[PDB]
Design a protein around this ligand. Sequence first.
Ligand SMILES: CCNS(=O)(=O)c1ccccc1Nc1nc(Nc2ccc(N3CCC(N4CCN(C)CC4)CC3)c(OC)c2)ncc1CCc1cc(OC)cc(OC)c1
Length: 288
Amino acid sequence: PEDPKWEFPRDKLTLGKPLGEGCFGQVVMAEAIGIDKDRAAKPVTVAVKMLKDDATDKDLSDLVSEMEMMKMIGKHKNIINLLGACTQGGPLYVLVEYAAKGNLREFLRARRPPGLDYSEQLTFKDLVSCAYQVARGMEYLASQKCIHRDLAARNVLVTEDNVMKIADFGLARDVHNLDYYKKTTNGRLPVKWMAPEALFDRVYTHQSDVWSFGVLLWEIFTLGGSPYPGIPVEELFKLLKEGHRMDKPANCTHDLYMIMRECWHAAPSQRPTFKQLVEDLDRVLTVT
Ligand SMILES: CCNS(=O)(=O)c1ccccc1Nc1nc(Nc2ccc(N3CCC(N4CCN(C)CC4)CC3)c(OC)c2)ncc1CCc1cc(OC)cc(OC)c1
């Protein structure tokens, strides 16, 4: 179906360097002339998401659904914003703000301290800021009655300005009706970030995102450490069922570990909301 307000003209888009690929599509850098509705003759660098080379009918419907998930949500500073879409006469191209500095996982990894033997930095305060930014975006997201379901450092992107922008509405779900989502189906899932109720019982909520945010905290304060490294899905299950929790990172203050562990209550309803997480991180950002 047509949507003239988002429609963007093919002849104004030059596809550029590939960036990598997600689940439903691949991403390239691109030049889009006058994307900056305003002024106007100037080419803006954007990201373009399009079908992969081996794409199924489902990938197409998922990519459209992801596009829609974005049109719904609305604009927020801490969310990757939709910019437009070539949907007519040629492949689907979805046009989206470019984050120059890549995803957060590699961002953090890239600025680990090298050796003294090997070859700005980042402060503790920088790390809490990232946590906060993501908390704010998830807060906005939740209030738009939508669930992320894929929240992880690799799914936050960083602008030239070091602004965190949540991305990958691949598994994102409009929840306006019920205020939760139930899977009942089978597919490929980000298991090491997933709350027990979501993993074992297929129930998703803003509260299962909160558990995941927990894991993103761990990722931030380890500077892109991998949760449960090498441990196979067989064994994650085992560890969760026993109520294992990840250890406190060296760089983590006690305060922040409490926020972390709080996100990992067994009972969903005992976890803070994103609203509270914003509050808690604001405070901690404040005392630093
Ligand atoms: C994960 C899922 N995200 S994705 O979008 O599928 C996706 C997967 C892979 C790559 C990029 C993306 N996407 C985006 N990437 C950027 N900037 C970026 C810059 C640099 C790198 N680098 C550069 C360094 C790096 N080196 C290269 C050489 N190598 C040898 C060593 C390492 C490789 C990665 C980068 O990779 C992260 C990313 N900006 C925006 C997006 C669009 C986001 C989006 C689109 C959308 O359209 C519907 C809907 C959304 O929310 C619904 C969100």
